[PDB]
From Swiss-Prot:
It is found in: Cytoplasm; Cytoplasmic vesicle, Autophagosome; Nucleus; Cytoplasm, P-body. E3 ubiquitin-protein ligase whose activity is dependent on E2 enzymes, UBE2D1, UBE2D2, UBE2E1 and UBE2E2. Forms a ubiquitin ligase complex in cooperation with the E2 UBE2D2 that is used not only for the ubiquitination of USP4 and IKBKB but also for its self-ubiquitination. Component of cullin-RING-based SCF (SKP1-CUL1-F-box protein) E3 ubiquitin-protein ligase complexes such as SCF(SKP2)-like complexes. A TRIM21-containing SCF(SKP2)-like complex is shown to mediate ubiquitination of CDKN1B ('Thr-187' phosphorylated-form), thereby promoting its degradation by the proteasome. This is E3 ubiquitin-protein ligase TRIM21. The coiled-coil is necessary for the cytoplasmic localization. Belongs to the TRIM/RBCC family. Induction: Up-regulated by IFN. Disulfide bonds: none annotated. Autoubiquitinated; does not lead to its proteasomal degradation. Deubiquitinated by USP4; leading to its stabilization. Autoubiquitinated. The gene is Trim21. The chain holds residues 291 to 468 of 470 of the full protein.
Length: 185
């Protein structure tokens, strides 16, 4: 792909983080802690899952960023509406305001309803995410495999401002402690 010139500098919004997340000083890395991180509750925080939003809001244009997923067993990445549900149980789907892919149990899937099997020959260490607001497109790229396409959501109905979306996943196994990291431009 040739989307690199739409690179945007994403930072994480502490206020939206699940209370077990640890966000680095530079707001570019997140991992799930082994306990509650001693923050107050608020209506923005994802309560049920180890999720956090980027601070940036997008309502027009083309945007691109990259995320490092090295050594993780489970994660979700993409974009979501600013107005997504924060509290209780929900599925990641475009009907609920999410445009995402994930790794889970050694398979990759797109967050359609129902979910769609992805075909990845080279497990990615970094993921590129491209959003074209006007076109209604969200695309995912395998940076480890020379930028090969992973998945395109088209005919997207954003229906509001978009925010970068992250889930570091649980660490029941002891093998999923590693952070998600926003990679330099
Ligand atoms: O099972 C665990 O590792 C943590 O449980 C508490 C919790 C933390 C974050 C989100 C939901 C529940």
């Amino acid at each position: 792909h040739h989307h690199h010139h739409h690179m945007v500098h994403i930072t994480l919004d502490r206020n939206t983080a699940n209370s077990w997340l640890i966000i680095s000083k530079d707001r570019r890395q997140v991992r799930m802690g082994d306990t509650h991180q001693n923050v107050s509750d608020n209506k923005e925080r994802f309560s049920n899952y180890p999720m956090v939003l980027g601070a940036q809001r997008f309502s027009s244009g083309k945007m691109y960023w990259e995320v490092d997923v090295t050594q993780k067993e489970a994660w979700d990445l993409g974009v979501c509406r600013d107005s997504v549900q924060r509290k209780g149980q929900f599925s990641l789907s475009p009907e609920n305001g999410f445009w995402t892919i994930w790794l889970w149990q050694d398979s990759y899937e797109a967050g359609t309803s129902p979910q769609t099997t992805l075909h990845i020959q080279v497990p990615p260490c970094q993921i590129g995410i491209f959003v074209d607001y006007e076109a209604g497109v969200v695309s995912f790229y395998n940076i480890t495999d020379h930028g090969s396409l992973i998945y395109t959501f088209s005919e997207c109905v954003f229906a509001g401002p978009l925010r970068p979306f992250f889930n570091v996943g649980f660490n029941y196994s002891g093998g999923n402690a590693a952070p998600l990291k926003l990679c330099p431009l």
